[PDB]
Amino acid sequence: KREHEREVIQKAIEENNNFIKMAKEKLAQKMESNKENREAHLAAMLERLQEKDKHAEEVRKNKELK
Amino acid sequence: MREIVHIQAGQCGNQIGAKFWEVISDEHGIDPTGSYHGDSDLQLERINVYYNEATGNKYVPRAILVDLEPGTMDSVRSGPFGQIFRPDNFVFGQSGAGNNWAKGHYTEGAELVDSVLDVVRKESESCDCLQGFQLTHSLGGGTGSGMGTLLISKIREEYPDRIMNTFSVMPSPKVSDTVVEPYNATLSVHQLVENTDETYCIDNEALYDICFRTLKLTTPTYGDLNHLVSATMSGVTTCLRFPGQLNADLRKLAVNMVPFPRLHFFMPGFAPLTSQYRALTVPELTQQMFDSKNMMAACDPRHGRYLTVAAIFRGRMSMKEVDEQMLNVQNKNSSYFVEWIPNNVKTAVCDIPPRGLKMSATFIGNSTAIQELFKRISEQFTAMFRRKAFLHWYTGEGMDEMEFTEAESNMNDLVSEYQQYQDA
Ligand SMILES: Nc1nc2c(ncn2[C@@H]2O[C@H](COP(=O)(O)OP(=O)(O)O)[C@@H](O)[C@H]2O)c(=O)[nH]1
Ligand SMILES: [Mg+2]
Numbered sequence: 001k002r003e004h005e006r007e008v009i010q011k012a013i014e015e016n017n018n019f020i021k022m023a024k025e026k027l028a029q030k031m032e033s034n035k036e037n038r039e040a041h042l043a044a045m046l047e048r049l050q051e052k053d054k055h056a057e058e059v060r061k062n063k064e065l066k
Numbered sequence: 067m068r069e070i071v072h073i074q075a076g077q078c079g080n081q082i083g084a085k086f087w088e089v090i091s092d093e094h095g096i097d098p099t100g101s102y103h104g105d106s107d108l109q110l111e112r113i114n115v116y117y118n119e120a121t122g123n124k125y126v127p128r129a130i131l132v133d134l135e136p137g138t139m140d141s142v143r144s145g146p147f148g149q150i151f152r153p154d155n156f157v158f159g160q161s162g163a164g165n166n167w168a169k170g171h172y173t174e175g176a177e178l179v180d181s182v183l184d185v186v187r188k189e190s191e192s193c194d195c196l197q198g199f200q201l202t203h204s205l206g207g208g209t210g211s212g213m214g215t216l217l218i219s220k221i222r223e224e225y226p227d228r229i230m231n232t233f234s235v236m237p238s239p240k241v242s243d244t245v246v247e248p249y250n251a252t253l254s255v256h257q258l259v260e261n262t263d264e265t266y267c268i269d270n271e272a273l274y275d276i277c278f279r280t281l282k283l284t285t286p287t288y289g290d291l292n293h294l295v296s297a298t299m300s301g302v303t304t305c306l307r308f309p310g311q312l313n314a315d316l317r318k319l320a321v322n323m324v325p326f327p328r329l330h331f332f333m334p335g336f337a338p339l340t341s342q343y344r345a346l347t348v349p350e351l352t353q354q355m356f357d358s359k360n361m362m363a364a365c366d367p368r369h370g371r372y373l374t375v376a377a378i379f380r381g382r383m384s385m386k387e388v389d390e391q392m393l394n395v396q397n398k399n400s401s402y403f404v405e406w407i408p409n410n411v412k413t414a415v416c417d418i419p420p421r422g423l424k425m426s427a428t429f430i431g432n433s434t435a436i437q438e439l440f441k442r443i444s445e446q447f448t449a450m451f452r453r454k455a456f457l458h459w460y461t462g463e464g465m466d467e468m469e470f471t472e473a474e475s476n477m478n479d480l481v482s483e484y485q486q487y488q489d490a
Contacts, residue, residue: 001219008172008464015462 067315069193070115070306071186072129072200075217076163076170076210078235079203080131080138081288082268085296086202087127088147090116090307092421093300098147100124108418111309118192130155130185132217134174134209135162155189157182163208165243167250168463170212179213183220190225197316198229198263205254206237206247206270215257222261229316230262233299236439238271238364239446241291246456248446249470255440256473259328259480263320266302266332266430268295269439271364280359281341293341298334298362300420301428304378308416323374323432325407329484331436333363335429342423348387351379351427356395363439370434370488372403375411381425385415406490434488437481444477 074083091097094113095104101123102110117125127150133139139158142148159178163170190196199221203210218230234254237247258265273294277286305314324330337354338346346354355377358366379388392413396403403410420426450456451470461467 002223005172005176005216008168009176010464012173012462012464015464 067195067197067317068114069118069128069196070198070200070316071189071193071196072116072127073132073182073186073202073214073217074129075132075201075203075214076207077133077135077138077204078207078288079201079210079214080133080142082233082235082292082295082299083129083131083202084142084145084147085292086299087129087150089296089300089421090303091127091147091150093418094307096125096150098150100126100150106418108308112307112313115197115307116303118189126150126152128189130157130182130189132157132178132182132209132213134159134170134178134213136160155185157185163213164459165206165246165250166208166459166463167212167246167253168460168465170208170210170214171216171253172212172465173463175209175213175216179216179220182217183224186221187224196225196228198225198231200316201230201232201234203232204235204237204270205251205258206235207243207250210235211250211254215254215261218257218261229264229320231316232258232262232265233268233295234258234265235295236267236269236271236363236443238269238274240274241270245450246459248443248450249456249460251443252447252470252473252477255443255480256476258331259476262330264316264323264330264332266298266334267363267436267439268298268334269363272362275364276339276359276362277341280339283341290341294336294339294362297340297420298336298428301336301378301380301426302334302430304380304416304428305414308418310414310416312412312414314414319376322412323376323430325373325432326483326487328480329373329432329487331432331440331480333361333365333367333431333433333436335360335362335431337427338423338425340422345381345424348379348383348391348425351425352388352391352395355427355429356399363436364442365433365435365438367402367431367433367435369438370402370436370484373407373410373432373434373487375403375432376430377411377413378428379413379415379425380417380427381419381423382417383415383425388413388415404487404490434484437484437488440477440481440484444474444481447474 074080095109118128120126131139136158161174203214205211273291277283277290337351
């Protein structure tokens, strides 16, 4: 019986710890995937704007030949 | 053997225990300070059983007060006879147990239990011959229920040859604090089946009913119940505290009340039920005492059969009338007494009556009807368990459904065994 008691309280400690741990993981995965996603979006936006810039240089060059 | 060691665990436990110490301290002439101030010698002849003598006459209840919350025990230190208790013997945590059996038994209680056992050793080692221990608790909360049973085990590990005795309050929907009470009860009934020699089953249901439909108290308080309780506890501890013919011990009681090891669950009864200028007649006391409307359980003895019975008669009356009426109750209703245990109703008389009363009768029954109490609980338990309700509170403390399953089975079995003997 004493061993059973030690096992039960051990189970409780382990289960709370596993909770805190799985929480910490899940949250880190989420924060990191969010940061990767947001950065990707802003990168593609700035790159669209860069292609806009390159086409403006293209236009100016096309006129300085006419 | 002589000295008893008394333990109060939990709210209900410390409440009924504090009342009990008030009541019998009065009976024994001990003022709230520990000084004897009574007339008779009878009051001090066996005072060693429940009180340790100290310093200038001072008597100190050999009691250990235990709780996981500081409330009820502060309440006790504060109130009437509050400082008759050895201050060292207050052992308390701060967390509480949240009416959770798992918490009192496995997690929070486990922290506190070793300091309790420390005080237990200190008292036991200062005894000439320790009979055993008496515990007060409910089975429906968390501290009393779970921590108390854990203590029962611990103490049995350390004193396997002594007697375990409990006044255990059974829960009832009529008087409920939490829905998990059936679980808690079924868990500790399990422990009690295995680790006590004698448990007085004090059912809150009966105390309610007797408060409501007899004392005619429409709105009963826990004090109303606890006055019935302290009356019973004085009653059934009398022959252990007073000299006389059948100088009683806890073991002889067990030997004389427990035909089979597991069936050690007793039904107490008391007359006259109070809440009294006219003393009754022996006939009255007797018949009141054996009626159900005076049982502190809930079961009707006419539904099963007395295995063993002990009656105590307190006051000044004729022993001839006492013997006549006792044999009249048996000979008349000889159907409700098993025929394979000959001469199973014993009777004692003590001259000192309880406070307020001039004549009184207490009664202790090993009756098969207790199965009803257990059955009630089993049902309530099952209902919830069948849909695994409110189990998270326990599972989150490390427990498994298997434990519950086992417990249930055991109680079911108990009932069965009891029935087996009702048909014999
Ligand atoms: N008769 C009686 N029953 C009580 C008292 N206090 C609580 N109960 C019952 O005991 C159970 C609650 O347990 P409680 O003693 O408060 O919890 P604990 O402190 O964890 O052990 C419920 O079944 C209540 O009905 C009391 O003072 N007298
Ligand atoms: Mg409570």
